[PDB]
Nucleic acid binder design. Structure first.
Ligand code: MG
Ligand code: MG
Ligand code: MG
Ligand code: MG
Lengths: 154, 153
DNA sequence: TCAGACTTGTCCACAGGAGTCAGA
DNA sequence: TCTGACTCCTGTGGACAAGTCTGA
């Protein structure tokens, strides 16, 4: 478990509240138990001109990747264990996205228990809904009621 | 001259580098000596549904204002003296806009000497170009060359 | 099977100016 | 004469999703 400097976390929190994104998704997964697959993503977006800034994040956080998409680049972290480690330390300093951060951590922690009963999996899918609600969601398709539709059918 | 807490300045620098803006403008003015005036602006933009965040920023900074326009709100500060003191303290923590901040500080400090010679004023307007060059400028009109043309009269 | 690397798409929520105006 | 408040606007540079595919 990596320990991060406080001044680094304080600046980064401000930058994340601004140009960052804490994302919780429910993805279609045919080769799956409940035909769905949870996905948690911490993301920092920046113009490719300033990709160097995102590249530094990979070294400073110790994990994650940088991908290009159009005229824009993104730092990307979805691996659960270091994500949980990173968000735990970052959370006390977030102002706009603190609740999204806490919800993701909660999803991550109660993740294996959710992969038992279909009811518990659906309860966490509602936690995912709340994250999307807190964000400025605009193109969401798969929700908890989408899961329930494929759940109450079988 | 107020002195800001370091943790506040560290978070703020992050949010400024992300959703904020450091703007230098050359505005036409028929009443002024060189037909152009300078305006420096510290800007923080956010959606109106989060105007409260900008409202807190007014209280914490202790100066500036919040304006609305559409579904988007803005904290802004153009008053030179508090701007200089604010940017002086924020500067060392900035990463993406550190240069813009230093140029604004430089412009402010050379403002009295700028109202003396046209060449020196052009030099200051040149510094305004650099800030715009550092920003993601897309709708800029009046530049130092605009001043050069007018000065040639 | 399944988390995790990586791509593509859309709609803004920003950034970064342009102006005008009152009062100093 | 001169500054700062204040409004309006463009053109993105973000945000927040949607997805494919693979290795063990
Ligand atoms: Mg933002
Ligand atoms: Mg919302
Ligand atoms: Mg930004
Ligand atoms: Mg530029």
């Amino acid at each position: 478990n990596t320990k991060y400097n406080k001044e680094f976390l304080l600046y980064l929190a401000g930058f994340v509240d601004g140009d960052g994104s804490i994302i919780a998704q429910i993805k279609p997964n045919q080769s799956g138990k409940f035909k769905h697959k949870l996905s948690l993503t911490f993301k920092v977006t920046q113009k490719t001109q300033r990709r160097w800034f995102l590249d530094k994040l990979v070294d400073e956080i110790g994990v994650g990747y940088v991908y290009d998409s159009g005229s824009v680049s993104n730092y990307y972290l979805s691996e659960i264990k270091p994500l949980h480690n990173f968000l735990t330390q970052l959370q006390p300093f977030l102002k706009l996205k603190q609740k999204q951060a806490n919800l993701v951590l909660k999803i991550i922690e109660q993740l294996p228990s959710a992969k038992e009963s279909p009811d518990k999996f659906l309860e966490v899918c509602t936690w995912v809904d709340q994250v999307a609600a807190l964000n400025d969601s605009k193109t969401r398709k798969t929700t908890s009621e989408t899961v329930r539709a494929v759940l109450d059918s079988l």
